[PDB]
Amino acid sequence: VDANRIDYLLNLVSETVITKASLNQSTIEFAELYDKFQNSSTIYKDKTRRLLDKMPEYLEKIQQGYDINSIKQDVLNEYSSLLEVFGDFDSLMKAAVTKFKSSSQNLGRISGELQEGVMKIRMVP
Amino acid sequence: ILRVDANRIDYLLNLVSETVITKASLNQSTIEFAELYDKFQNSSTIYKDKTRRLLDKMPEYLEKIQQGYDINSIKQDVLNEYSSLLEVFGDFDSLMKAAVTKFKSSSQNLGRISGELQEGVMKIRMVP
């Protein structure tokens, strides 16, 4: 066999180990993203329960003549942040998907090269 | 200008086959996470619509109770908005966790295969 053909196979395996390292890093990124979603989900579900449980106190104040605008001020000040409870989940997720897709596609390219290269040595008599 | 063992080349073929299988599984995991991103985006839009509606309704509904509206209808509608909001992402947390678990499994398998490929390809090289 050609010496340079075997050195190409060694270089492809080197590319595989690097791609393996990047894919491992991607598993950690997606585990972190799962944790972030799970935490934000539990937090919003807990906080929205607290909001509903607060409503009778707001009613008591209104019944005593408290300004409804002050109630609105209290509600929005405490609870409007619910809108952002997931933080940067979506942008972090999109970036992690893009990075994972690139590494996975590169692995496909390497594996195709490995397949054809080793298959062509299997064809030498 | 190199000599290689035929049987070791067939062994490397089986390692490359395992690599291709793992790659196909990793590709499906990229699609799974892309689907989950899209699902999060769609459900997050609904989540914000529902949260804005609940926040707007609460002071309005307090005023309506004071104006003499049927209080049960107010309580019921708040609870109905609240349960819709609690369920807006459905089983996303479980689906995301399962997707991470599958990806971790295939990634670890790739690490094992890559170690075997490294030793396998280096040992086919014989002199003269």
Residue numbers in the entry:
A (entry chain A): 5 to 129
B (entry chain B): 2 to 129
Quote from the publication.
Sequence alignments of Td CheA with CheA homologs from a variety of model bacteria with previously characterized chemotaxis systems indicate that, in Td CheA, an additional ~50 residues join the canonical dimerization domain (P3) helices. Analysis of non-redundant P3 domains from all CheA classes reveal general sequence conservation in the canonical helices but highly divergent sequences at these additional residues. Furthermore, CheA-F2 proteins contain the most residues in this non-conserved region. Interestingly, aromatic residues (Phe, Tyr) cluster near the helix breakages, and unusual core packing of these residues allows for maintenance of a coiled-coil register despite a disruption of helical heptad repetition in the C-terminal helix. The net result is a distortion in the alignment of the hairpin tip, the consequence of which is currently unknown. Different orientations of Tyr83 in the two subunits produce asymmetry in the added tip region. However, a linear arrangement of CheA is present that generates “strands” of rings interlinked by the CheA dimerization domain (P3). Furthermore, the Td CheA P3 domain is clearly discernible in the sub-tomogram averages, which has not been previously observed in vivo. As the CheA:CheW rings have to undergo substantial bending to accommodate the baseplate curvature, the elongated P3 domain may have evolved to stabilize CheA dimerization by increasing the interface area. Because of the high membrane curvature, the receptor trimer-of-dimer modules are expected to be further splayed, and the elongated P3 may compensate for the increased distance between receptors and P3.
